[PDB]
Amino acid sequence: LSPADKTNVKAAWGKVGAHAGEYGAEALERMFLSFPTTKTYFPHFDLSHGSAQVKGHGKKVADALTNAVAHVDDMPNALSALSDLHAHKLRVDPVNFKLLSHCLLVTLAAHLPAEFTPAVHASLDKFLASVSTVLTSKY
Amino acid sequence: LSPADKTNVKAAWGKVGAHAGEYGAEALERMFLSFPTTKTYFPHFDLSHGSAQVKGHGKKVADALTNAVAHVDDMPNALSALSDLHAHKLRVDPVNFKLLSHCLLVTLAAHLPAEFTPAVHASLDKFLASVSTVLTSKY
Amino acid sequence: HLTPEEKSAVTALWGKVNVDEVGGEALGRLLVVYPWTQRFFESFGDLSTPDAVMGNPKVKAHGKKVLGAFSDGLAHLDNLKGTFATLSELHCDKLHVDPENFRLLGNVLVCVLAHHFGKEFTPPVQAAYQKVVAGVANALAHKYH
Amino acid sequence: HLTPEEKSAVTALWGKVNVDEVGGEALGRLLVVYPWTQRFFESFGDLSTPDAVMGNPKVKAHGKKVLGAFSDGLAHLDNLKGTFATLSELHCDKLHVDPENFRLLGNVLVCVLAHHFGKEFTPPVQAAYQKVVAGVANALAHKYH
Ligand code: HEM
Ligand code: HEM
Ligand code: HEM
Ligand code: HEM
């Protein structure tokens, strides 16, 4: 990521803060309804609206992306464990990471319309691409 | 790249050898004839069979992949000049790196039947995917 | 293939869409987020920075023409292939645009609806629009098969 | 979408294809090179390494059913949407396979044909085979559209 990208991302993710987990839930919910092929990776989950499990997992995704923003310069060693989980054990199709990153961008738009400028949209797309590249590295 | 993938690539690329530039030419031909949208990036070339220009370019692409094998641990640094050409100057659609990588694998299978095992096939895909990723990293 | 209740949420949200802006906003963001797309639009002038692109007069004007073809596509959801017959011919035979990029403008459009509408843009409203843009993207890529 | 010299070259090479083994090497190479694909074949048993996958007799068995389907597609090149309509339903609504994975299997099938025919798999022959697989990949993706 360029220095202009680091700035825009850290600024934008600062202004989420506590709302982080609540936003992650909404992103997962959007993914499940918009792309029903992704629901088969979660047979052990209640996927009904306002589900206890999706709120709880929502916060686990959000915490992961915050650490990434915090460790933006050393991303492959801040997320190393999650590649093994997603690539080796869960066998997650690479196209599915583009689907979540896209629903993640629809959530930040719908919630931070003042900070979702075209230059910030581009920085966040680059950031979520990087995150995806690391998670799929064990392929 | 894993230790095994590195060994497997140095094996296959070893057997290619002095023919690399000739296979480089074939892969470009195969791509132009199979995926004819890719032609739009070479309006200044004679793209007929056995063109002097496609042979001369075959060598340049071949010599760049040989550099990359030699510098597999420092690929981002070995190709950074090529990455600025393809993203900044030429503006190459990322989807196109996938079509050239496919046409290289098709050329190698046809020429090195003994060497093109399932394991070597999988290592060579990872290697060209790694190159494509560095060549699209200014996006 | 939409349900009655999907179709009536789609059609109901579109009749409040600012037609003179969102189109440009969509096209402008595609050119900034996926910079390779700029090579198709050289004659439009200055695309060097995000500020240049969004305020480019030939971008905003071309945004209206794109959103104008979307508006035709909703009318005729039972016959998109035919509605977009001539646009598929232009885009695939004349311009040689990789279909992977029709999907990308489909999704950039969804981020913009969300941007403007906010909470009125719900997950099930999104899943309806996601179904639309995909169909548009497929219809446009028809001359490639 | 094929010339008369294209269709002839396609049919000449296909008659020479070991129907018994090419199918299996192609389904085998998919599972090794693109390992996320193994989760749809959990019950074929031991896919834990390259040599297990190419040795596994249920991969080989199933590989014949897949080549069987391509053959059947070649016979009806002017009506593919019709020929694959049932398999499209199976893959799309029941199994939930992302249609990008249909493109990958067709490209692995072209790698496998080049491994077996070497020099005979000339650029113009490959280019007719690329048209065919794009045809089949797109026909199996129909129930998503
Ligand atoms: C930005 C992208 C992603 C991030 C940051 C992310 C992060 C995480 C984290 C932190 C965990 C839990 C680790 C733990 O157990 O302590 C997890 C689990 C999981 N993720 Fe993801 N993930 C991403 C994308 C995806 C996608 C696209 C899918 C599927 C379509 C997926 C499916 C799963 C599944 C199935 C689990 C395990 C569920 C369970 O065991 O209860 N992930 N992810
Ligand atoms: C593995 C992928 C690729 C490699 C290693 C590669 C390598 C190269 C090299 C070494 C050059 C010469 C640079 C120079 O003259 O200084 C070059 C130029 C070029 N490449 Fe690529 N390339 C790749 C993929 C692509 C693809 C996919 C396209 C288009 C479909 C493309 C289009 C071009 C063009 C248009 C030029 C400039 C030709 C000229 O004006 O002389 N490249 N590439
Ligand atoms: C997915 C939905 C899309 C729609 C509905 C759409 C619609 C249109 C329309 C209506 C025109 C005007 C045709 C005319 O009246 O003469 C046009 C022109 C054009 N479109 Fe698109 N388009 C789409 C996607 C794309 C994409 C992704 C690209 C490139 C990356 C693209 C590149 C162009 C170009 C280059 C022109 C020609 C402009 C000129 O020089 O006059 N289109 N499009
Ligand atoms: C060109 C691409 C493909 C063709 C022509 C094809 C063809 C077939 C055929 C003919 C069958 C047998 C149908 C039956 O038994 O009733 C089948 C079954 C199946 N296919 Fe495919 N297929 C393709 C791609 C894929 C891909 C990419 C995957 C997974 C990534 C997949 C997963 C399956 C599975 C899981 C079965 C059922 C096996 C069982 O439980 O017995 N297919 N396919």
Numbering used by the authors:
A (entry chain CCC), B (entry chain AAA): 2 to 140
C (entry chain DDD), D (entry chain BBB): 2 to 146
Task: Show me the paper's own sentences about this structure.
We explored this matter with an X-ray-pump/X-ray-probe experiment employing haemoglobin microcrystals transported via a liquid jet into the XFEL beam.
Crystal structures extracted from the two data sets also differ. Here, we describe a time-resolved X-ray pump X-ray probe SFX experiment, performed at the Linac Coherent Light Source (LCLS) in Menlo Park, USA, to test the effect of a shockwave launched bythe first (pump) X-ray pulse on microcrystals further upstream in a liquid microjet, as probed by the second (probe) X-ray pulse at the upstream point after a 122.5 ns delay. Shockwaves are launched, propagating supersonically along the jet stream and outrunning the explosive gap that opens up behind them. Associated with the shock front is a nanosecond-duration pressure jump of roughly 0.1–1 GPa (1–10 kbar), which suffices to induce protein unfolding. Since our pump-probe attributes were chosen to emulate EuXFEL operation at its 4.5 MHz maximum pulse rate, this prompts concern about such data collection. Our findings have implications for the anticipated 4.5 MHz repetition rate of EuXFEL.
